[PDB]
Amino acid sequence: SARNEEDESCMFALKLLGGFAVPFTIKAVIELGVMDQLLTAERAMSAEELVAAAVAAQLPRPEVACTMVDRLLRFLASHSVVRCTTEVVVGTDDATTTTCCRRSYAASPVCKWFARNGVEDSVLPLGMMILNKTFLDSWQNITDAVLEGAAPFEKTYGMPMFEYLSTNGPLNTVFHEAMANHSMIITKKLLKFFRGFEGLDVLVDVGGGNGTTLQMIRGQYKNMRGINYDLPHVIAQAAPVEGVEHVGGSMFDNIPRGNAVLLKWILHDWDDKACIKILKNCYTALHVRGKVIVLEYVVPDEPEPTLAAQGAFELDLTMLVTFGSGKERTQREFSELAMEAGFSREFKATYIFANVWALEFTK
Amino acid sequence: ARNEEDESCMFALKLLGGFAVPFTIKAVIELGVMDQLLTAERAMSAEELVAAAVAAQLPRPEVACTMVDRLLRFLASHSVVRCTTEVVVGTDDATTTTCCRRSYAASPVCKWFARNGVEDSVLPLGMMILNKTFLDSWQNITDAVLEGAAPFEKTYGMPMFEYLSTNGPLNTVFHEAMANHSMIITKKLLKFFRGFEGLDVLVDVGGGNGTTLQMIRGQYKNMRGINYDLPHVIAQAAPVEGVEHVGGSMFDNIPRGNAVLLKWILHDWDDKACIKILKNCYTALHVRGKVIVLEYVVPDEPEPTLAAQGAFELDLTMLVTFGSGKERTQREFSELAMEAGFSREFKATYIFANVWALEFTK
Ligand SMILES: NC(=O)c1ccc[n+]([C@@H]2O[C@H](COP(=O)([O-])OP(=O)(O)OC[C@H]3O[C@@H](n4cnc5c(N)ncnc54)[C@H](O)[C@@H]3O)[C@@H](O)[C@H]2O)c1
Ligand SMILES: NC(=O)c1ccc[n+]([C@@H]2O[C@H](COP(=O)([O-])OP(=O)(O)OC[C@H]3O[C@@H](n4cnc5c(N)ncnc54)[C@H](O)[C@@H]3O)[C@@H](O)[C@H]2O)c1
Ligand SMILES: COc1cc(O)cc(/C=C/c2ccc(O)cc2)c1
Ligand SMILES: COc1cc(O)cc(/C=C/c2ccc(O)cc2)c1
């Protein structure tokens, strides 16, 4: 609609500067309980009906709350996050932010990924880490961190993230729930789309937590045995799982022996030398023809302006912000690390879901 | 594995990640890399852009280059910069990818981030939009809504204009953003808007040091100006030929003239406060006088266009800053004017960057 190229140029610059407004608006609609009412609603609902349904608490300024929610949802409607219908009101009205007319709102399909059921296959626990204030604050310190060649997180909090989490119980839970949430989704998709668990006697899951992933995998492959390998303090908290041995240890020291080792979102935390050491421990732990299964995004060789590529470079920036030298890798960069660790010139890539690939390297 | 379910999920993650572009552009500006992009003659690698932007010896110069490379690659995937890739005659150590070296050029949009070309930039406004103090309020929307309060006030315990009195650096950031936007809009007004023709006296409510009036008089030499602003702002203004500085509150009175300019005033305020301002404009105006409202105009329905999204984005900015400040539709502006006494006579002239000049007539 801009009146010339100069005008459209200016508005695009403002748009680029303002991209934080959508995520922060979504967070509020979620936290208010409005997004869950949209998701269970049988028809479109006005801001007033959404607030009445979402809030049990008696509000001091209920009319202000309703118009504010109307403004939040109208903004998300402009971004196709929700559907909006407008009707004429016969009467007077003040639980909408316009003269004659009342908006009613329905969830778009994308909204199901924000569900608070948590495991209805939602990414909400991941989203709450993505938009966590403690983590977001690091993004304001990128400049100085680059100048020192440090992680923005380190430059913000004085120390690496994994150290800091030991000192912040609440942030630690947010982080672990996000990890667990993404793990659950990808594990399910793996059992739908990936065939590389066929023929395995023993699978070693590094960073397996309580061993949920191995348990779900054994649900489909009943004769496979699992080793759940994680830090001693994580293993101490792990209840028995049938067919899974919990083993405490550092992946930098050793990996337990097996037919395959699973690394999900491990390598992208670490620089190339650390990755090579992890893959060398995988290599010594495997019998010949054994495999490493890497569950990671793969960035394209060039910066393609696609939805998937943008999300992969967005994850690269998250890694820069969090760890500094943690990073997302191309297929070739993954191949090179594996060959450095001793693996053959034999590469498989199976696309799974949500930008995650299963890359398999073979001894 | 890639279907509608997959696209849906990626879309969800994209919506949650929208902050990454703005934060990355900020870093690239603040490192001085954007300015090197804007003066460059050709695509430059991260290494070249760092060497050119940074005076100091860095402790970890190769880490800094590879980090900038990653920032720029991300911006390339969003079409903010142009990237080309060439095979390294050897082995790099200042690009993230060893085979190959990326070089980058500014896209046209980057001119809007310039630190001082001789043209228009929105960089002072952008520094306000991405200022940490202001951004921190957006993390407090849920509790401010439940209380019916402005997120900003819930975050800092006072109204934004009161807070600026307590934070001189933020006060500068705010005023420079307003002055930047006002400068661009006043020049576009002199280009496109014809409603200053014929006016004896123009009253600029919130006119600061009188720069707007000074510029308009530069084109309309027989017009006189009344620069109306708070006494403390007027105390600081130097004399302006053909302009009288007057101190006061727009809630008490407006100086009389043929036209009153209200730029980004009404959107700070609720309907009751707007009606007070407009009733004061009405009584102040001589007959056939006009209020000239310089605001964004939100469409009647939430259209998914670049311009509409920009207007609802400013709406949420007003929500966050003031709570009850808000963007309006044409109909809502008309209705406030009619409540203040103005006639059923409405003009709208599109100016630039989503701003309209709306005129109401006594
Ligand atoms: N960059 C490196 O090469 C590097 C980094 C850290 C530790 N190490 C080596 O590791 C040994 C132990 O030192 P430490 O206790 O600081 O390191 P650690 O065992 O705590 O390892 C560091 C990080 O790696 C991850 N990790 C380690 N083992 C894991 C496992 N089984 N599952 C999931 N994640 C795991 C965790 O995120 C942890 O914070 C030392 O010999 C040390 O040199 C090497
Ligand atoms: N939106 C609302 O919060 C709301 C609601 C209903 C009524 N009101 C009315 O507004 C009053 C609150 O305002 P206040 O008492 O804090 O006063 P105030 O005028 O001192 O408020 C500060 C702001 O007023 C503006 N201002 C006032 N006169 C100006 C002038 N001549 N030139 C430029 N800018 C000028 C500036 O934007 C300044 O930052 C209420 O007492 C009532 O009259 C406001
Ligand atoms: C914080 O207080 C104020 C007061 C005011 O009068 C205007 C603004 C405008 C902000 C803005 C943000 C994003 C954009 O893309 C374009 C403008 C903010
Ligand atoms: C904070 O530390 C970590 C460690 C880790 O292994 C993964 C992530 C992933 C974040 C992320 C962000 C945005 C998305 O869209 C998708 C994932 C973050």
TrEMBL record, chain A:
Keywords (A to Z) from UniProt: Methyltransferase, Nucleotide-binding, S-adenosyl-L-methionine, Transferase
Gene3D superfamilies: Vaccinia Virus protein VP39, Winged helix-like DNA-binding domain superfamily/Winged helix DNA-binding domain
Single annotated GO MF: nucleotide binding
Binding residues for NAD(+) 2: G207, D230, G249, M251, K277, S325
Binding-site residues, NAD(+) 1: G207, Y229, D230, G249, S250, M251, K277
Pfam families reported in the protein's UniProt record: Dimerisation, Methyltransf_2
SUPFAM superfamilies per record: S-adenosyl-L-methionine-dependent methyltransferases (SSF53335), Winged helix' DNA-binding domain (SSF46785)
Domain of life: Eukaryota
Cystine crosslinks: C100-C101
Binding of NAD(+) 4, residues: D230, G249, S250, M251
Identification of the protein by name: O-methyltransferase domain-containing protein
GO process terms (BP): methylation
Active site (UniProt): H268
Native species: Sorghum bicolor (Sorghum)
Positions bound to NAD(+) 3: G207, D230, S250, D271
